[PDB]
Amino acid sequence: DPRVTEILERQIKADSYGASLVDLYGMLQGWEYCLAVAAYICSIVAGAALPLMTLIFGDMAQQFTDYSSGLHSNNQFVDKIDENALYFVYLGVGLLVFNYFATLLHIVVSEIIASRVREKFIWSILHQNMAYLDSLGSGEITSSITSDSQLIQQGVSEKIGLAAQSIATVVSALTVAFVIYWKLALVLLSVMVALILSSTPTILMLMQAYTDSIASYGKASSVAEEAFAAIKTATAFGAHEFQLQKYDEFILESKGYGKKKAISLALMMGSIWFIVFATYALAFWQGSRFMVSDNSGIGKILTACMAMLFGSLIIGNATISLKFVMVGLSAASKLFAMINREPYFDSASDAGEKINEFDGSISFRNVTTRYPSRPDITVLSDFTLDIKPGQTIALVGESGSGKSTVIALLERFYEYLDGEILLDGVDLKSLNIKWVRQQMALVQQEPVLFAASIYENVCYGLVGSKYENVTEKVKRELVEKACKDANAWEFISQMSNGLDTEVGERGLSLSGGQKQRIAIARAVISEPKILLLDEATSALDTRSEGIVQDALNRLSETRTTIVIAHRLSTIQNADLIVVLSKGKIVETGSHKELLKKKGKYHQLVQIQNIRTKIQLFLMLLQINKGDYYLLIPCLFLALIAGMGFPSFALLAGRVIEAFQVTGPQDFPHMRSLINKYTGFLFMIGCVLLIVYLFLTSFMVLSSESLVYKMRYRCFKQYLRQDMSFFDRPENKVGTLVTTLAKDPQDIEGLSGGTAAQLAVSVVIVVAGIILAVAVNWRLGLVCTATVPILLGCGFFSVYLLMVFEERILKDYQESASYACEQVSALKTVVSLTREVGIYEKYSNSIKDQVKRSARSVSRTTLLYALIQGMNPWVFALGFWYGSRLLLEGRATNREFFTVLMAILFGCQSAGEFFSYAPGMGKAKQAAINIRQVLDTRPKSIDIESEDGLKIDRLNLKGGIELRDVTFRYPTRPEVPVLTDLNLIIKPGQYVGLVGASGCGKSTTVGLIERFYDPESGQVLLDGVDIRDLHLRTYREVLALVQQEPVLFSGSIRDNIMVGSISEEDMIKACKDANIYDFISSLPEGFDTLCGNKGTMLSGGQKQRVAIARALIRNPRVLLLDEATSALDSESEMVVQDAIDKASKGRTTITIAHRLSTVQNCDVIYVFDAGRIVESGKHDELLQLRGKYYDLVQLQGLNA
Ligand SMILES: COCC(CCO[C@H]1CC[C@@]2(C)C(=CC[C@H]3[C@@H]4C[C@@H]5O[C@]6(CC[C@@H](C)CO6)[C@@H](C)[C@@H]5[C@@]4(C)CC[C@@H]32)C1)COC
């Protein structure tokens, strides 16, 4: 026991891992560490060289101020301005070169690292034991292959380079500010740190508001999950407003937290735009104060102030880059946990023996095993079977007996705790696992063909064989012989291309028989010694089964086969038959020897014989008409927030003019002017604080209101669709839930802080351009020509970063699809021992992809680096032209610096809107999606249409008539379910419908509830076609009890009152359903929460609750769609008692699986091929000795 539990856990145990940047960068080998080192050096250099514009700008400001005061001649002014302009040009060239190299090398390093990670992950997954792989499923592996490697790239991509660059920019800016002027640098740093630590509660408030909103929608998404999954019940009982209200009570909490988010974001914006203005004001004021004792200068004051603001305002890009780094370190932890986990079986290694001249004899001895998923159920107990070369065993039994476990043990998919399996006398636990899998040939129930030619598909079976490395000409002969031995040449030679025809997602689309015949050829081409047929023909049809069975019989006549069959008629010629029940060999023997024994095999063959006998702005603007009271003041607020910066420009120009001292004699006047202008600078820096607070608050409130409206209307629109909408493949529950989660949240990109920043940006740019033209027309025209350049650079930087982000996922699609295809089926790949070939092909593919992507990245990085280097060139040109104008007398120091601050610096602040450009693509795709969703309507079955006759309850009888009803499910329209059905149910009749699987009796409920409309026919209620009746009232007439009871989350009172057409009736119906006593037994009364398995009541109790729910409305037509199919025999008694009690006094249509429920029905209708075959009472159908007799005999035999 301590050993078997250890084995069953070590089979499935999954260790936890913590990945750091060391693990990611350890995939670089040899000369690829120089690439990473050079990338980081270039990033650091290009980040540290950026705050030198502050040095050159301060020097140029000092030169302009000194010349305007007449401290040097024209020639010296020209010389110094030219030299400083060249310094700008050199800085721009250096920024270009280093940005290019840093970005290119970072991207290349990320490509290399992720290629190594992908190779390692695929090599691990392909060699894990099948117990662990079945634990994860395919979804966990396919997701890890496609969207968890992209995150690992982004972690080590140019994002980490930008994070390092930004940290270097902060360090270099602080270093510049301290060296040039530590007195003012220290003062500014202290004040800014005090104003940043003070705004710490606001950041906590924002993060709490985001967490609360995410949690509240998480709860709301759960209500949507149940509503779409349980959509048949909701439509049948009209619980559309109930589920919509449940959703609304949770998407209103998100709006309340969005309010707090609005205040917090407004506070953060106001604090930032107050810190900047207070830093300018304090820098100028305290630099004028210090200057009367240091003679430092406006140049040094500007250098210090600009350096401090530079480093502080570069922090925001660093945070998103570090978020990107940390997101890719969480995925790295998962992938490295899945890589470093060592498998239970060492199938990768070459250890183990290899039997020479393997005859094929197998000898099981006392074999006992458990699956790791369920360590209490024993799926095989004391299995003993000695198989000789050439024999044909045939394991049979009921489902769950454990016949299929033998094949899993022989292929080393799972581990047998106790026993012994000997291949020609050699233990199975001491053999090379891949060799053992090569000696066998697993023909599975579902054939899996890979997207390749038929020749390649059949050649996949040659792995490890002696024919693996031979001439291609010989291989084609072998494939032809194998396809002829498998009865596959008849449809391959008839093909267009023949053996080279593509299959799978390309080329031709085969049938089940043809795919199974190609799988048989693939299995037989290797000349296996053991054949493992695992219900090969269980998934085929009557016509196609013959050819595949002939092929299998031809194959099994020589090899040591182990056939697992569900059609017992195909194994009559087996050399031995083993009957398994609950994991034990109940009896064994030949076909004749077992029939005479009157045993389990006889019952199985009897059952088999009996069965054989049988522009989008205006859209959202119109939707959010109610929020205008918030967006009308926002225009005025944005206009004021826009006048702000072009008045800081005027005051800054006047301050720079006031710093035109010629000696300590002019210091009192300079101090007076600096105080007078710094007062106004601080007053303006406080007005914009309030303006930004109000504007951002109002805009974020509007955005949250729009998101709430989108969610509410989208959920309301999903509930209006007919049942033909929800059974489409693209309207899955998990897809609709995801769409609700994403699109009403992505549409927020066209409102809120983004729209506020858009308005503020355009106003700021327009006001700055107008100010530059008005102050000096000769200087406001040239500097206007640079506004397109600066704005284009600011936009295209973000655009190219988006391009870099998207290339990561766009490039690795072919190889990811190939890997996901070969990982969708691990059992077939592992059976063929195709790990090595798949890994080689995948490794070659991604190695080629690295080189293919490096070139395109090198092409784009040139434009990115040029855009990065443009800015110092614009500065140089502007300063040179300004100096020339100021020499000619056509400009002034005040006018030049006012124009410069406004134009250049205003375009810098308004480029923050371009950081919201990535959202505007999502916010347009989501707008298109929401427009499509909000406009879709059901063709005829509209629950929210008020047209149609109303059913008068006084004259209602309850007569249902299906007149010549023909119906096909629109998802599968080639398979008719009901054909020319004629069925009349008299009022008060307890009609029961019975039949075999696929007869289509359950479609009667769908037609009566009007889930679907019949293609040709007429369903009538009291002589009125239900297509001409009011849908809500009509469905209020009917009631429905389903096979699997569904109870919505909430109290028992809420669930049972879902089917309330209009407190006494509730108690009366709860007593009539034999559930009132159980409810009274509960600690609370009808307030017990049975949601998400809150109390997990018994199936009988949940069915009785559903019966009471259907019974409150007092229906005229009670539909019981196999109510007692999933109930225990003890609870079935009370449930059937409740059903019989409820069936009195109303029309009752009872679809039945167990024929005992329909025993006392007034009329019984037998279904076959969608048409009524027999009809009448129980005794008459028994006397007719027809299909009903066969069904009751089958029920008796099944027991
Ligand atoms: C945007 O919303 C994203 C959302 C929720 C994230 O919550 C917040 C977590 C803190 C974070 C990263 C956020 C916004 C601005 C960020 C701040 C800007 C400020 O700038 C500085 C420097 C410059 C100074 C002038 C002001 O203060 C920093 C100290 C401040 C800052 C870097 C501190 C961290 C802030 C988002 C998650 O979405 C998946």
Q: What is the 3-state secondary structure (H, E, C) of 131-178?
A: HHHHHHCCHHHHHHHHCCHHHHHHHHCHHHHHHHHHHHHHHHHHHHHH
CA 511 to mean position of chain CA atoms? 32
Query: What residue's CA is closest to ligand 1, atom 25?
Result: 272
Q: Is the CB of 178 under 6 A from ligand 1?
A: no
Greatest alpha-carbon pair distance for the chain in Å reads 128
CB-side exposure of 1076: number of CA atoms within 13 Å? 11
Kindly state the tokens that stand for 60: 């140029």
Q: Is the CB of 203 under 6 A from ligand 1?
A: yes
Q: In this structure, is the dihedral angle defined by the CA atoms of residues 731, 736, 738 and 744, taken in order, positive or negative?
A: positive
Pocket test residue of 205, 276, 315 for ligand 1, highest count of atoms within 8 A of CB: 315
Pocket test residue of 195, 214, 319, 692 for ligand 1, highest count of atoms within 8 A of CB: 319
Ligand 1 atom index nearest CA of 316: 32
Same fold, 392-574 and 960-1198: yes
Return the H-helix or E-strand segment holding 443: strand 440-443
Cα separation values, 860 from 45, 100, 102, 801, 1175, Å: 21, 9, 13, 10, 76
Binding residues for Mg(2+): 404, 534
Amino acid at residue number 681: L
Q: Is the CB of 207 under 6 A from ligand 1?
A: yes
Ligand 1 atom index nearest CA of 320: 12
Pocket test residue of 191, 210, 212, 754 for ligand 1, highest count of atoms within 8 A of CB: 210
Q: Judge contact between 702 and 189, C-beta under 8 A.
A: no
Q: Judge contact between 109 and 850, C-beta under 8 A.
A: no
- 281 CA to centre of ligand 1 in angstroms: 24
Kindly state the tokens that stand for 530: 């053991």
Ligand 1 atom index nearest CA of 276: 25
Q: What residues does 561 pair with on adjacent strands?
A: 392, 531
Q: What residues does 393 pair with on adjacent strands?
A: 562, 576
Q: Judge contact between 416 and 380, C-beta under 8 A.
A: yes
Q: Is the CB of 319 under 6 A from ligand 1?
A: yes
Kindly write down the DSSP assignment for every residue of 926-961, as one continuous string: HHHHHHHHHH---SS--TT---SB---SSS----EE
Pairing of strands 584-589, 1117-1121: unpaired
Query: What residue's CA is closest to ligand 1, atom 8?
Result: 207
- 324 CA to centre of ligand 1 in angstroms: 14
- Other CB atoms within 10 A of residue 236 CB: 25
CA distance 1034 to 1026: 8
CA distance 671 to 654: 13
Kindly state the tokens that stand for 92: 């721009």
Q: Is residue 376 helix, strand or coil?
A: coil
CA distance 647 to 680: 10
- 1141 CA to centre of ligand 1 in angstroms: 65
Ligand 1 atom index nearest CA of 315: 22
- 131 CA to centre of ligand 1 in angstroms: 45
Cα dihedral 880, 884, 887, 890 in deg (nearest 10):
-120
Residue with tokens 């093909």: 495
- 306 CA to centre of ligand 1 in angstroms: 21
Residue 1009: Cβ-neighbour burial (10 angstroms; 0-12, 13-18, 19+) = buried
Residue with tokens 């490039």: 811
- Kindly provide the b/e burial profile for residues 264-297, where b requires at least 16 CB atoms within 10 angstroms of the residue's own CB: bbbbbbbbbbbbbbbbbbbbbbbbbbbbeeeebb
Q: Judge contact between 49 and 872, C-beta under 8 A.
A: no
Which is nearest to 1161 in space by CA: 1142, 1186, 1140? 1140
Describe the strand order of the beta sheet including 976-985 as a list of residue ranges.
Answer: 976-985, 960-968, 1016-1021, 1024-1025
**Secondary structure letter of residue 1062 according to DSSP:** -
Binding residues: 404, 534
Ligand 1 atom index nearest CA of 199: 27
Kindly write down the DSSP assignment for every residue of 60-74, as one continuous string: HHHHHHHHHTTSS-H
Query: What residue's CA is closest to ligand 1, atom 6?
Result: 207
Q: What residues does 362 pair with on adjacent strands?
A: 387, 423
Kindly state the tokens that stand for 515: 């795919």
- 319 CA to centre of ligand 1 in angstroms: 7
Query: What residue's CA is closest to ligand 1, atom 29?
Result: 196
Q: Is residue 441 helix, strand or coil?
A: strand
Kindly state the tokens that stand for 954: 């006084």
Peptide-bond breaks in the chain following residues (C–N over 2.5 A): 614, 1062
Kindly write down the DSSP assignment for every residue of 40-56, as one continuous string: HHHHHHHHHTTTHHHHH
Return the H-helix or E-strand segment holding 1173: strand 1171-1176
Instruction: Kindly give, in sequence order, each residue whose CB lies less than 8 Å from that of residue 940, ignoring residues fewer than 6 positions away.
Output: 722, 1013, 1027
Q: Judge contact between 498 and 490, C-beta under 8 A.
A: no
Q: Is the CB of 316 under 6 A from ligand 1?
A: yes
Dihedrals φ, ψ of 642, to 5°?
-95, -35
Kindly state the tokens that stand for 595: 């029939």
CA distance 266 to 700: 8
**Secondary structure letter of residue 1089 according to DSSP:** B
CA distance 768 to 770: 5
Residue 1047: Cβ-neighbour burial (10 angstroms; 0-12, 13-18, 19+) = buried
Q: Judge contact between 536 and 443, C-beta under 8 A.
A: yes
Beta strands in 686-821 (DSSP E): none
- Kindly provide the b/e burial profile for residues 703-727, where b requires at least 16 CB atoms within 10 angstroms of the residue's own CB: bbbbbbbbbbebbbbbbbbbbbbbb
Query: What residue's CA is closest to ligand 1, atom 37?
Result: 210
**What fold does the segment set 392-574 form as a domain?**
Rossmann fold (3.40.50)
CA 823 to mean position of chain CA atoms? 18
Q: What is the length of the chain?
A: 1199
Kindly write down the DSSP assignment for every residue of 558-625, as one continuous string: TSEEEEE-SSGGGGTT-SEEEEEETTEEEEEE-HHHHHTTTSHHHHHHHHHHHHHH---HHHHHHHTG
Domain locations in the chain?
183-295+625-750+912-945, 392-574, 960-1198
Q: Is the CB of 1098 under 6 A from ligand 1?
A: no
Q: Judge contact between 313 and 222, C-beta under 8 A.
A: no
Pocket test residue of 193, 217, 268, 688 for ligand 1, highest count of atoms within 8 A of CB: 268
Amino acid at residue number 756: A
Residue with tokens 């997701």: 143
Kindly write down the DSSP assignment for every residue of 186-239, as one continuous string: HHHHHHHHHHHHTTHHHHHHHHHHHHHHHHHHHHHHHHHHHHHHTHHHHHHHTT
Q: What is the 3-state secondary structure (H, E, C) of 460-518?
A: HHHCCCCCCCCCHHHHHHHHHHHHHHCCCHHHHCCCCCHHHCECCCCCCCCCHHHHHHH
Kindly state the tokens that stand for 131: 């117990």
**Secondary structure letter of residue 182 according to DSSP:** H
Pocket test residue of 166, 192, 196 for ligand 1, highest count of atoms within 8 A of CB: 196
CA distance 895 to 1162: 101
**Where does 936-1081 have alpha helices with state H?**
1003-1008, 1031-1037, 1052-1056, 1064-1072, 1076-1081
- 336 CA to centre of ligand 1 in angstroms: 30
CATH superfamily to which 183-295+625-750+912-945 belongs: ABC transporter type 1, transmembrane domain (1.20.1560.10)
Q: Judge contact between 299 and 81, C-beta under 8 A.
A: no
Kindly state the tokens that stand for 742: 């994403």
Kindly write down the DSSP assignment for every residue of 865-922, as one continuous string: HHHHHHHHHHHHHHHHHHHHHHHHTS--HHHHHHHHIIIIIHHHHHTTGGGGHHHHHH
Instruction: Kindly give, in sequence order, each residue whose CB lies less than 8 Å from that of residue 592, ignoring residues fewer than 6 positions away.
Output: none
- 207 CA to centre of ligand 1 in angstroms: 10
Query: What residue's CA is closest to ligand 1, atom 4?
Result: 210
Instruction: Kindly give, in sequence order, each residue whose CB lies less than 8 Å from that of residue 586, ignoring residues fewer than 6 positions away.
Output: 579, 580, 599, 600
- 316 CA to centre of ligand 1 in angstroms: 7
CA distance 319 to 205: 18
Q: Judge contact between 517 and 549, C-beta under 8 A.
A: no
CA distance 331 to 144: 8
Ligand 1 atom index nearest CA of 271: 26
Radius of gyration of the chain (CA): 39
- 315 CA to centre of ligand 1 in angstroms: 9
Amino acid at residue number 304: A
Q: What CATH architecture applies to the domain 960-1198?
A: 3-Layer(aba) Sandwich (3.40)
Query: What residue's CA is closest to ligand 1, atom 32?
Result: 316
Q: Is residue 325 helix, strand or coil?
A: helix
- 958 CA to centre of ligand 1 in angstroms: 65
- 22 CA to centre of ligand 1 in angstroms: 27
Describe the strand order of the beta sheet including 530-534 as a list of residue ranges.
Answer: 440-443, 530-534, 560-564, 392-396, 576-581, 584-589
Q: Is the CB of 327 under 6 A from ligand 1?
A: no
